[PDB]
């Protein structure tokens, strides 16, 4: 009873809208996955914390090096 | 029929307004209605019209009506109650007229009581 506008039809995202046993096999699959891509983020924010202050580090030294371009211009 | 003997026909457009306005007439007198709205006397005012069309000795009357199902519902009281009186159902489909196919019959989904050997 769908192939008409009077016959009911469904919504998009509705089987986390029951609460059935579909809904909770759902929402805790969702937690089994983005709890351990949570500790492979969580620990790589050692290195690039790190890295962010080398590529200012980077920039630095770039800087520096117009500097003495200069510096040795004046002389 | 009568006065000629012939075979008749007779169309109507529908028969489900037929059924709605007898609930009108019926609701401003005042009677208290049946099932999912409609009037009580249902069944007898469907039955005093569809009993006139019968095959006499002199002649007949066949009949064609339209029906209309409502809310997608076959047992919606009142295509239950028109049911009870058909004789074969026709069916028209949109999907066999985009084949290219005159008239658009169903023939997998139209019925007819008298099939019987």
């Given at each position: 009873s769908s192939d008409t506008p009077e016959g009911v039809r469904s919504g998009a995202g509705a089987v986390r809208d029951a609460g059935g046993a579909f809904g909770k096999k759902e929402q805790a699959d969702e937690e089994r996955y983005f709890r351990a891509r949570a500790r492979e983020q969580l620990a790589a924010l050692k290195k690039h914390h790190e890295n962010e202050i080398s590529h200012h580090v980077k920039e630095i030294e770039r800087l520096q090096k117009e500097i003495e371009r200069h510096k040795q211009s004046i002389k | 029929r009568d006065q000629e003997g012939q075979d008749v026909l007779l169309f109507i457009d529908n028969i489900f307004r037929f059924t709605q306005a007898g609930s009108e007439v019926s609701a401003l007198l005042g009677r208290i209605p049946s099932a999912v709205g409609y009037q009580p006397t249902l069944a007898t005012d469907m039955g005093t019209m569809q009993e006139r069309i019968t095959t006499t000795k002199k002649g007949s009357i066949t009949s064609v009506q339209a029906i209309y199902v409502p809310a997608d519902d076959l047992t919606d009281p009142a295509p239950a109650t028109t049911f009870a009186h058909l004789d074969a159902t026709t069916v028209l489909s949109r999907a066999i007229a985009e084949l290219g196919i005159?008239?658009?019959?169903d023939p997998l989904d139209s019925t007819s009581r008298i099939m019987d050997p």
């Open positions: - | 005159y008239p658009a019959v």
